[PDB]
Amino acid sequence: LKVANEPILAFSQGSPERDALQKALKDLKGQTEAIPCVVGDEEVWTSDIQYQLSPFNHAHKVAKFCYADKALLNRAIDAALAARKEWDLKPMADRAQVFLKAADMLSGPRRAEVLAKTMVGQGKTVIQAEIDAAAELIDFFRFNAKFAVELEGEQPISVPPSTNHTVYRGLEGFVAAISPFNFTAIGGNLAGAPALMGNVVLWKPSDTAMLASYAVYRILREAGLPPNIIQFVPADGPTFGDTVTSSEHLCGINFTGSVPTFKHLWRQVAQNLDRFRTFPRLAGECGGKNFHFVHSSADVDSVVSGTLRSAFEYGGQKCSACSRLYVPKSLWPQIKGRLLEEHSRIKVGDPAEDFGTFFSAVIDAKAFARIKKWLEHARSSPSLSILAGGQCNESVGYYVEPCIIESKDPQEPIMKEEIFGPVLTVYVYPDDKYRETLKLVDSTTSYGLTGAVFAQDKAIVQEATRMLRNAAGNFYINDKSTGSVVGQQPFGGARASGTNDKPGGPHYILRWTSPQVIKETHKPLGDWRYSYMQ
Amino acid sequence: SHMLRWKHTSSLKVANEPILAFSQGSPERDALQKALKDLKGQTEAIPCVVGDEEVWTSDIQYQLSPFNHAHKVAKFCYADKALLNRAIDAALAARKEWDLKPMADRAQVFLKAADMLSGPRRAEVLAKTMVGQGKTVIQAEIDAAAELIDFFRFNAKFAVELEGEQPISVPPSTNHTVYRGLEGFVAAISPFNFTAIGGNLAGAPALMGNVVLWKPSDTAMLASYAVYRILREAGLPPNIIQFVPADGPTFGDTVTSSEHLCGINFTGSVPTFKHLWRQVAQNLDRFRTFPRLAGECGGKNFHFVHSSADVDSVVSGTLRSAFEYGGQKCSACSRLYVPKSLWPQIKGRLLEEHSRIKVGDPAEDFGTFFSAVIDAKAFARIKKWLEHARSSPSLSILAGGQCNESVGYYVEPCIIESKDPQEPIMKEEIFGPVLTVYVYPDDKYRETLKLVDSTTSYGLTGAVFAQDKAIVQEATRMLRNAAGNFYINDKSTGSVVGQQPFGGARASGTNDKPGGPHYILRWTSPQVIKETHKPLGDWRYSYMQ
């Protein structure tokens, strides 16, 4: 199977895609979709009513949905389990076709819809929605399909008189997929990749991404996904976790979210090991405290633009976002001056109404409050100084201005803890202490996700690459730490950042298959004795 | 201009190690006889090895020859917690250099070891496996030579070729995947029943740039140390694999208490694997990263016979699967399902052939089909099952049933018929030469297939014997999750590396398929590097204008 990356559109004035997106945005203005739980083909409502709000205009309820209760989740498990055998018995190509068709739908007739729902529901600007809900999701579907189809070609050696064949079985049981607010594409992949490999899935989408998540779900069903392969089950986090880890039929958890929550689930599975029919497989992507490290030889313009994008795009709400910047003293006057000047030109506003917007409001009231606590800390700490930004206002949307802070302490809590907001901390190091500082990049935090080194000196780049080998699972030389592209930079890291299964690469699907090898022997067997025994 | 330069990757041609015949007057048979004589009356004192240091503790232990337990084949010792922690520290201090070695250079160690085992060291590892674990010539050959050699060669091939799996690059950037070893140390915990498994459990992670504390099986110590010495002689640097026999609980407590644990590669009992899994979960907040647990845990494996089966193949294949190495294989057949129509023929043949099976000393008598079971514990457990068979109204002993531990841990091959398909003996793994047969009415073959699938907690191996294509297809679909290694018209044991990657799910383990191309992927944590070759543009996008 041959596939290439989906083009990223330019959205120029008068372009087909820009006109289409404008219409799709108008289509959502003032609209609230009532999104039910879906079990099989049944639309189910519980009394536990919830609302998704538009981050930049929280008066706009973009969706009304509901939390599945323990009983509904258990029913969804039973129904999914009954559908699994036939789905798993389908040829890999046939399952792949559902995802390739979904990809073509997302590429063409449904592109504007999923972009708009991501913009309005999750607060993304045009380009952030485009690289996510269109390109990344489309690529996940096409590339995973390729990887899966090609995996069936990975076959063992046959020696006469026997034939050996590997059957890439789905896991026996159900998989729980738990997706985060910040990428529409991640939800599609967490539920979709296991379904592709013959699994059945309970998908708990993020509350704050419900609108776009359900849009993806409907596209999958329309593309031919049969009933009970993916159950669409919004739920209270702890309730969902308690329920799926209580089921003897759990065979996997595909999770993206907080370290503590992943650890909790891991411990619940361990507490219940004696109940499960097999050992569940846990996959977790858990975030980072990502660095941009600058050497004195760096191209300053690239450092400035790449760091502004990495730190502030989508309000810094990316597991890969740069939140610690290391600058040599000799370049600090340039970099400080340029950062502060460019900062004043950043437009924060309504991304639907003003395409001039660089980024918009953060996702919800809880994120707003957490980020404000960090800004307040920056106003308190003796080692921290706010250089620009730091304002926030939640009267209309959850608006946080981009903030640039200098720390005199390379080990300050703000240098260690993931904020998930538009908050960049800078540490200025003595030029002659670059090696010691590289060590600090590696040793300071508990995380291992992304990092960038900016330098134009080969020896420095080689040295830094070796030293930072385990500080970043996605490591960048002279580029920003965000924006991994499927099939090009498979994404993930170790240390506290998760299990590193590298979604976006060729091996990720292997977590969702449990292979069986069949040997057929075509000649009758001989005696049980061996000739040497005679 | 590219600051990171990536070398072209090479390929490796390997094939399965040929099984030798050991005919009379043959060089391999003479060499094996000599190696066996070399062990007669000998006790090897086997130290813990940390780096290059041979260390002794006060916890002295002995390995006994299963068929002559008066023979202590090895004296060894259990590493204490202090020594285990010192071994961890030293391994960690050696890890970065080892991880940074080119994959091809690490692979060379295993290819060299494979050649040593194939040629000059073959008789030695075979004899130590025979004498120390009670294997016959052919069981030692397929294990300590063929399988271990194949693990080393095929894993080396898979690893070298894995570096060729690289992402797409598009202007203005170059993308490269670095297959990093795991950051921390791996604990390898190996079982008595295959010398080769210990070599793979410790060796595969080492190949991928990891450092390892290897706790070998007490009852396979002699052969295990031989493998360890060969690896060091083949060029494995110090502190990459620490040879640390230890009390099981103590070992598990120590490794799961280290913040630097990054994996456990385990083969053994279900309860022990679960215990380790729970200890890791308990200590989750202490670890630098999430440890990777791999476990292969045994089975209650079936041979299912359809009325269209070739009777002779059923009999020979079942006798081998049930009784070779005393049935001490995670893949051994312990339940046979036979249709009423073929039961007279099959029963007759099984009983006839049974009377011809020779049990005895595998070193002194090459006519021996299989020998004593591994130890006093195994013997005691099997004895209790034989007694259960006599007591249970649902069970009748058709052949064998006797045992004698006065000289070795000797158990007759035993064939039992159950009238109850759900009898405990149909469900519980015995790890002894005990076959249970259930006879089903021909017209209930479908219902019976459902029973094959549902009766046990395991999913490791199974075989269907049938010459009807429709039936084979049906059974293959019905039994999809009853066996990770499924056999059509062949016995349920004897998977060969590169041909039948081995492992199963349900209670049988994590199914990472050692012997296949993907196993090594559990022991690498890839990093992707993107190098961009042009200055970046503005932070704004054109559509914002």
mmCIF file with all atom_site columns, N, CA and C in Angstrom, chain B residues 470-517:
data_model
loop_
_atom_site.group_PDB
_atom_site.id
_atom_site.type_symbol
_atom_site.label_atom_id
_atom_site.label_alt_id
_atom_site.label_comp_id
_atom_site.label_asym_id
_atom_site.label_entity_id
_atom_site.label_seq_id
_atom_site.pdbx_PDB_ins_code
_atom_site.Cartn_x
_atom_site.Cartn_y
_atom_site.Cartn_z
_atom_site.occupancy
_atom_site.B_iso_or_equiv
_atom_site.pdbx_formal_charge
_atom_site.auth_seq_id
_atom_site.auth_comp_id
_atom_site.auth_asym_id
_atom_site.auth_atom_id
_atom_site.pdbx_PDB_model_num
ATOM 1   N N  . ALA B 1 470 ? -12.318 -28.508 5.345  1.00 0.00 ? 470 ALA B N  1
ATOM 2   C CA . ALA B 1 470 ? -13.385 -27.698 5.924  1.00 0.00 ? 470 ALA B CA 1
ATOM 3   C C  . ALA B 1 470 ? -13.270 -27.683 7.447  1.00 0.00 ? 470 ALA B C  1
ATOM 4   N N  . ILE B 1 471 ? -13.004 -28.856 8.013  1.00 0.00 ? 471 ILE B N  1
ATOM 5   C CA . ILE B 1 471 ? -12.860 -28.997 9.457  1.00 0.00 ? 471 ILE B CA 1
ATOM 6   C C  . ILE B 1 471 ? -11.657 -28.209 9.966  1.00 0.00 ? 471 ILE B C  1
ATOM 7   N N  . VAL B 1 472 ? -10.547 -28.294 9.240  1.00 0.00 ? 472 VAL B N  1
ATOM 8   C CA . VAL B 1 472 ? -9.341  -27.578 9.637  1.00 0.00 ? 472 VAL B CA 1
ATOM 9   C C  . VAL B 1 472 ? -9.618  -26.078 9.660  1.00 0.00 ? 472 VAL B C  1
ATOM 10  N N  . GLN B 1 473 ? -10.255 -25.572 8.609  1.00 0.00 ? 473 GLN B N  1
ATOM 11  C CA . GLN B 1 473 ? -10.610 -24.159 8.554  1.00 0.00 ? 473 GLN B CA 1
ATOM 12  C C  . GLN B 1 473 ? -11.525 -23.761 9.715  1.00 0.00 ? 473 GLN B C  1
ATOM 13  N N  . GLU B 1 474 ? -12.542 -24.578 9.989  1.00 0.00 ? 474 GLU B N  1
ATOM 14  C CA . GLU B 1 474 ? -13.486 -24.314 11.080 1.00 0.00 ? 474 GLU B CA 1
ATOM 15  C C  . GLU B 1 474 ? -12.771 -24.262 12.431 1.00 0.00 ? 474 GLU B C  1
ATOM 16  N N  . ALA B 1 475 ? -12.032 -25.323 12.736 1.00 0.00 ? 475 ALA B N  1
ATOM 17  C CA . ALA B 1 475 ? -11.289 -25.418 13.986 1.00 0.00 ? 475 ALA B CA 1
ATOM 18  C C  . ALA B 1 475 ? -10.289 -24.274 14.117 1.00 0.00 ? 475 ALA B C  1
ATOM 19  N N  . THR B 1 476 ? -9.661  -23.903 13.006 1.00 0.00 ? 476 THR B N  1
ATOM 20  C CA . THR B 1 476 ? -8.686  -22.818 13.034 1.00 0.00 ? 476 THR B CA 1
ATOM 21  C C  . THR B 1 476 ? -9.356  -21.510 13.463 1.00 0.00 ? 476 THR B C  1
ATOM 22  N N  . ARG B 1 477 ? -10.540 -21.239 12.925 1.00 0.00 ? 477 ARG B N  1
ATOM 23  C CA . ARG B 1 477 ? -11.294 -20.065 13.346 1.00 0.00 ? 477 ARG B CA 1
ATOM 24  C C  . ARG B 1 477 ? -11.734 -20.166 14.816 1.00 0.00 ? 477 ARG B C  1
ATOM 25  N N  . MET B 1 478 ? -12.247 -21.324 15.224 1.00 0.00 ? 478 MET B N  1
ATOM 26  C CA . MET B 1 478 ? -12.791 -21.480 16.577 1.00 0.00 ? 478 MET B CA 1
ATOM 27  C C  . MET B 1 478 ? -11.717 -21.391 17.661 1.00 0.00 ? 478 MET B C  1
ATOM 28  N N  . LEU B 1 479 ? -10.494 -21.770 17.312 1.00 0.00 ? 479 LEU B N  1
ATOM 29  C CA . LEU B 1 479 ? -9.432  -21.921 18.300 1.00 0.00 ? 479 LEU B CA 1
ATOM 30  C C  . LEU B 1 479 ? -8.414  -20.789 18.210 1.00 0.00 ? 479 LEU B C  1
ATOM 31  N N  . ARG B 1 480 ? -8.793  -19.725 17.511 1.00 0.00 ? 480 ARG B N  1
ATOM 32  C CA . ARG B 1 480 ? -7.921  -18.577 17.271 1.00 0.00 ? 480 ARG B CA 1
ATOM 33  C C  . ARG B 1 480 ? -7.234  -18.025 18.520 1.00 0.00 ? 480 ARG B C  1
ATOM 34  N N  . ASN B 1 481 ? -7.962  -17.935 19.630 1.00 0.00 ? 481 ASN B N  1
ATOM 35  C CA . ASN B 1 481 ? -7.359  -17.435 20.869 1.00 0.00 ? 481 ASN B CA 1
ATOM 36  C C  . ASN B 1 481 ? -7.060  -18.491 21.930 1.00 0.00 ? 481 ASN B C  1
ATOM 37  N N  . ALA B 1 482 ? -7.226  -19.753 21.557 1.00 0.00 ? 482 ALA B N  1
ATOM 38  C CA . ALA B 1 482 ? -6.908  -20.852 22.461 1.00 0.00 ? 482 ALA B CA 1
ATOM 39  C C  . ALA B 1 482 ? -5.429  -21.211 22.383 1.00 0.00 ? 482 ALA B C  1
ATOM 40  N N  . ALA B 1 483 ? -4.750  -20.743 21.338 1.00 0.00 ? 483 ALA B N  1
ATOM 41  C CA . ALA B 1 483 ? -3.332  -21.077 21.145 1.00 0.00 ? 483 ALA B CA 1
ATOM 42  C C  . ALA B 1 483 ? -2.582  -19.997 20.375 1.00 0.00 ? 483 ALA B C  1
ATOM 43  N N  . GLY B 1 484 ? -1.477  -19.521 20.944 1.00 0.00 ? 484 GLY B N  1
ATOM 44  C CA . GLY B 1 484 ? -0.621  -18.544 20.281 1.00 0.00 ? 484 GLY B CA 1
ATOM 45  C C  . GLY B 1 484 ? 0.286   -19.230 19.264 1.00 0.00 ? 484 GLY B C  1
ATOM 46  N N  . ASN B 1 485 ? 0.537   -20.512 19.501 1.00 0.00 ? 485 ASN B N  1
ATOM 47  C CA . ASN B 1 485 ? 1.226   -21.361 18.543 1.00 0.00 ? 485 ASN B CA 1
ATOM 48  C C  . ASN B 1 485 ? 0.306   -22.515 18.245 1.00 0.00 ? 485 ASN B C  1
ATOM 49  N N  . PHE B 1 486 ? -0.236  -22.504 17.035 1.00 0.00 ? 486 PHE B N  1
ATOM 50  C CA . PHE B 1 486 ? -1.284  -23.436 16.662 1.00 0.00 ? 486 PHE B CA 1
ATOM 51  C C  . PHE B 1 486 ? -0.742  -24.348 15.574 1.00 0.00 ? 486 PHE B C  1
ATOM 52  N N  . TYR B 1 487 ? -1.029  -25.637 15.701 1.00 0.00 ? 487 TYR B N  1
ATOM 53  C CA . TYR B 1 487 ? -0.434  -26.630 14.829 1.00 0.00 ? 487 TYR B CA 1
ATOM 54  C C  . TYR B 1 487 ? -1.470  -27.465 14.110 1.00 0.00 ? 487 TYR B C  1
ATOM 55  N N  . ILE B 1 488 ? -1.290  -27.602 12.802 1.00 0.00 ? 488 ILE B N  1
ATOM 56  C CA . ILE B 1 488 ? -2.155  -28.463 12.005 1.00 0.00 ? 488 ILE B CA 1
ATOM 57  C C  . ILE B 1 488 ? -1.376  -29.713 11.589 1.00 0.00 ? 488 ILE B C  1
ATOM 58  N N  . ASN B 1 489 ? -1.812  -30.866 12.092 1.00 0.00 ? 489 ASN B N  1
ATOM 59  C CA . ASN B 1 489 ? -1.143  -32.139 11.815 1.00 0.00 ? 489 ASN B CA 1
ATOM 60  C C  . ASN B 1 489 ? 0.328   -32.196 12.231 1.00 0.00 ? 489 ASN B C  1
ATOM 61  N N  . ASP B 1 490 ? 0.639   -31.556 13.352 1.00 0.00 ? 490 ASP B N  1
ATOM 62  C CA . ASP B 1 490 ? 1.959   -31.693 13.950 1.00 0.00 ? 490 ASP B CA 1
ATOM 63  C C  . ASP B 1 490 ? 1.825   -31.533 15.459 1.00 0.00 ? 490 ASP B C  1
ATOM 64  N N  . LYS B 1 491 ? 2.855   -31.936 16.200 1.00 0.00 ? 491 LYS B N  1
ATOM 65  C CA . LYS B 1 491 ? 2.820   -31.852 17.661 1.00 0.00 ? 491 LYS B CA 1
ATOM 66  C C  . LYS B 1 491 ? 2.931   -30.420 18.195 1.00 0.00 ? 491 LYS B C  1
ATOM 67  N N  . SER B 1 492 ? 2.466   -30.226 19.425 1.00 0.00 ? 492 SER B N  1
ATOM 68  C CA . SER B 1 492 ? 2.327   -28.883 19.986 1.00 0.00 ? 492 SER B CA 1
ATOM 69  C C  . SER B 1 492 ? 3.612   -28.280 20.556 1.00 0.00 ? 492 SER B C  1
ATOM 70  N N  . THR B 1 493 ? 4.698   -29.057 20.568 1.00 0.00 ? 493 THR B N  1
ATOM 71  C CA . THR B 1 493 ? 5.990   -28.595 21.076 1.00 0.00 ? 493 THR B CA 1
ATOM 72  C C  . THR B 1 493 ? 6.990   -28.389 19.947 1.00 0.00 ? 493 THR B C  1
ATOM 73  N N  . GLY B 1 494 ? 8.133   -27.790 20.277 1.00 0.00 ? 494 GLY B N  1
ATOM 74  C CA . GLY B 1 494 ? 9.246   -27.722 19.345 1.00 0.00 ? 494 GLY B CA 1
ATOM 75  C C  . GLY B 1 494 ? 9.222   -26.571 18.352 1.00 0.00 ? 494 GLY B C  1
ATOM 76  N N  . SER B 1 495 ? 8.697   -25.430 18.778 1.00 0.00 ? 495 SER B N  1
ATOM 77  C CA . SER B 1 495 ? 8.820   -24.220 17.973 1.00 0.00 ? 495 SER B CA 1
ATOM 78  C C  . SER B 1 495 ? 10.284  -23.925 17.608 1.00 0.00 ? 495 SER B C  1
ATOM 79  N N  . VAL B 1 496 ? 10.493  -23.482 16.372 1.00 0.00 ? 496 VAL B N  1
ATOM 80  C CA . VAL B 1 496 ? 11.831  -23.189 15.871 1.00 0.00 ? 496 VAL B CA 1
ATOM 81  C C  . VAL B 1 496 ? 11.954  -21.703 15.551 1.00 0.00 ? 496 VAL B C  1
ATOM 82  N N  . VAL B 1 497 ? 13.016  -21.085 16.059 1.00 0.00 ? 497 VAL B N  1
ATOM 83  C CA . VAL B 1 497 ? 13.249  -19.656 15.893 1.00 0.00 ? 497 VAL B CA 1
ATOM 84  C C  . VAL B 1 497 ? 13.173  -19.283 14.408 1.00 0.00 ? 497 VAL B C  1
ATOM 85  N N  . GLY B 1 498 ? 12.466  -18.200 14.107 1.00 0.00 ? 498 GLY B N  1
ATOM 86  C CA . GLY B 1 498 ? 12.378  -17.733 12.740 1.00 0.00 ? 498 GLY B CA 1
ATOM 87  C C  . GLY B 1 498 ? 11.313  -18.452 11.934 1.00 0.00 ? 498 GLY B C  1
ATOM 88  N N  . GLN B 1 499 ? 10.781  -19.547 12.480 1.00 0.00 ? 499 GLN B N  1
ATOM 89  C CA . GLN B 1 499 ? 9.771   -20.352 11.787 1.00 0.00 ? 499 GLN B CA 1
ATOM 90  C C  . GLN B 1 499 ? 8.444   -20.341 12.548 1.00 0.00 ? 499 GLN B C  1
ATOM 91  N N  . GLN B 1 500 ? 8.506   -20.623 13.847 1.00 0.00 ? 500 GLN B N  1
ATOM 92  C CA . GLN B 1 500 ? 7.346   -20.483 14.716 1.00 0.00 ? 500 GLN B CA 1
ATOM 93  C C  . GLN B 1 500 ? 7.693   -19.617 15.921 1.00 0.00 ? 500 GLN B C  1
ATOM 94  N N  . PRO B 1 501 ? 7.682   -18.290 15.742 1.00 0.00 ? 501 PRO B N  1
ATOM 95  C CA . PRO B 1 501 ? 7.841   -17.402 16.901 1.00 0.00 ? 501 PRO B CA 1
ATOM 96  C C  . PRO B 1 501 ? 6.911   -17.875 18.017 1.00 0.00 ? 501 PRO B C  1
ATOM 97  N N  . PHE B 1 502 ? 7.390   -17.877 19.257 1.00 0.00 ? 502 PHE B N  1
ATOM 98  C CA . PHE B 1 502 ? 6.706   -18.601 20.324 1.00 0.00 ? 502 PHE B CA 1
ATOM 99  C C  . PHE B 1 502 ? 6.054   -17.693 21.367 1.00 0.00 ? 502 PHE B C  1
ATOM 100 N N  . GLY B 1 503 ? 4.823   -18.012 21.754 1.00 0.00 ? 503 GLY B N  1
ATOM 101 C CA . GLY B 1 503 ? 4.192   -17.299 22.840 1.00 0.00 ? 503 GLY B CA 1
ATOM 102 C C  . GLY B 1 503 ? 2.695   -17.307 22.665 1.00 0.00 ? 503 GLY B C  1
ATOM 103 N N  . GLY B 1 504 ? 1.971   -17.046 23.747 1.00 0.00 ? 504 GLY B N  1
ATOM 104 C CA . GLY B 1 504 ? 0.528   -17.042 23.669 1.00 0.00 ? 504 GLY B CA 1
ATOM 105 C C  . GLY B 1 504 ? -0.016  -16.078 24.695 1.00 0.00 ? 504 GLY B C  1
ATOM 106 N N  . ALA B 1 505 ? -1.294  -15.752 24.570 1.00 0.00 ? 505 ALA B N  1
ATOM 107 C CA . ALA B 1 505 ? -1.905  -14.808 25.495 1.00 0.00 ? 505 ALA B CA 1
ATOM 108 C C  . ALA B 1 505 ? -2.745  -15.510 26.569 1.00 0.00 ? 505 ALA B C  1
ATOM 109 N N  . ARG B 1 506 ? -3.917  -14.960 26.875 1.00 0.00 ? 506 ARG B N  1
ATOM 110 C CA . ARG B 1 506 ? -4.664  -15.381 28.061 1.00 0.00 ? 506 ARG B CA 1
ATOM 111 C C  . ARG B 1 506 ? -3.727  -15.400 29.266 1.00 0.00 ? 506 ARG B C  1
ATOM 112 N N  . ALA B 1 507 ? -3.749  -16.451 30.082 1.00 0.00 ? 507 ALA B N  1
ATOM 113 C CA . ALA B 1 507 ? -2.902  -16.446 31.275 1.00 0.00 ? 507 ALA B CA 1
ATOM 114 C C  . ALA B 1 507 ? -1.446  -16.801 30.949 1.00 0.00 ? 507 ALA B C  1
ATOM 115 N N  . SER B 1 508 ? -1.181  -17.100 29.681 1.00 0.00 ? 508 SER B N  1
ATOM 116 C CA . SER B 1 508 ? 0.120   -17.620 29.268 1.00 0.00 ? 508 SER B CA 1
ATOM 117 C C  . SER B 1 508 ? 1.217   -16.558 29.128 1.00 0.00 ? 508 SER B C  1
ATOM 118 N N  . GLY B 1 509 ? 0.864   -15.287 29.262 1.00 0.00 ? 509 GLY B N  1
ATOM 119 C CA . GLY B 1 509 ? 1.882   -14.241 29.247 1.00 0.00 ? 509 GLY B CA 1
ATOM 120 C C  . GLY B 1 509 ? 1.544   -13.032 28.392 1.00 0.00 ? 509 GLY B C  1
ATOM 121 N N  . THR B 1 510 ? 2.551   -12.196 28.145 1.00 0.00 ? 510 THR B N  1
ATOM 122 C CA . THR B 1 510 ? 2.383   -10.949 27.405 1.00 0.00 ? 510 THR B CA 1
ATOM 123 C C  . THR B 1 510 ? 2.498   -11.145 25.887 1.00 0.00 ? 510 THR B C  1
ATOM 124 N N  . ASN B 1 511 ? 2.946   -12.332 25.480 1.00 0.00 ? 511 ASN B N  1
ATOM 125 C CA . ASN B 1 511 ? 3.061   -12.721 24.065 1.00 0.00 ? 511 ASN B CA 1
ATOM 126 C C  . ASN B 1 511 ? 3.914   -11.804 23.179 1.00 0.00 ? 511 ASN B C  1
ATOM 127 N N  . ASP B 1 512 ? 5.177   -11.645 23.547 1.00 0.00 ? 512 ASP B N  1
ATOM 128 C CA . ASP B 1 512 ? 6.080   -10.776 22.808 1.00 0.00 ? 512 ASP B CA 1
ATOM 129 C C  . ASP B 1 512 ? 6.828   -11.515 21.714 1.00 0.00 ? 512 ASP B C  1
ATOM 130 N N  . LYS B 1 513 ? 6.510   -12.799 21.568 1.00 0.00 ? 513 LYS B N  1
ATOM 131 C CA . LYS B 1 513 ? 6.981   -13.617 20.455 1.00 0.00 ? 513 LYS B CA 1
ATOM 132 C C  . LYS B 1 513 ? 8.502   -13.643 20.249 1.00 0.00 ? 513 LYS B C  1
ATOM 133 N N  . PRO B 1 514 ? 9.241   -14.048 21.295 1.00 0.00 ? 514 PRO B N  1
ATOM 134 C CA . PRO B 1 514 ? 10.650  -14.360 21.093 1.00 0.00 ? 514 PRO B CA 1
ATOM 135 C C  . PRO B 1 514 ? 10.729  -15.404 19.989 1.00 0.00 ? 514 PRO B C  1
ATOM 136 N N  . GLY B 1 515 ? 11.705  -15.265 19.100 1.00 0.00 ? 515 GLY B N  1
ATOM 137 C CA . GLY B 1 515 ? 11.811  -16.140 17.952 1.00 0.00 ? 515 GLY B CA 1
ATOM 138 C C  . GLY B 1 515 ? 11.299  -15.465 16.695 1.00 0.00 ? 515 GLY B C  1
ATOM 139 N N  . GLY B 1 516 ? 10.658  -14.314 16.864 1.00 0.00 ? 516 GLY B N  1
ATOM 140 C CA . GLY B 1 516 ? 10.162  -13.555 15.726 1.00 0.00 ? 516 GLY B CA 1
ATOM 141 C C  . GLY B 1 516 ? 10.877  -12.223 15.598 1.00 0.00 ? 516 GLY B C  1
ATOM 142 N N  . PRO B 1 517 ? 10.549  -11.455 14.547 1.00 0.00 ? 517 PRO B N  1
ATOM 143 C CA . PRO B 1 517 ? 11.242  -10.199 14.237 1.00 0.00 ? 517 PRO B CA 1
ATOM 144 C C  . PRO B 1 517 ? 10.879  -9.028  15.145 1.00 0.00 ? 517 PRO B C  1
#
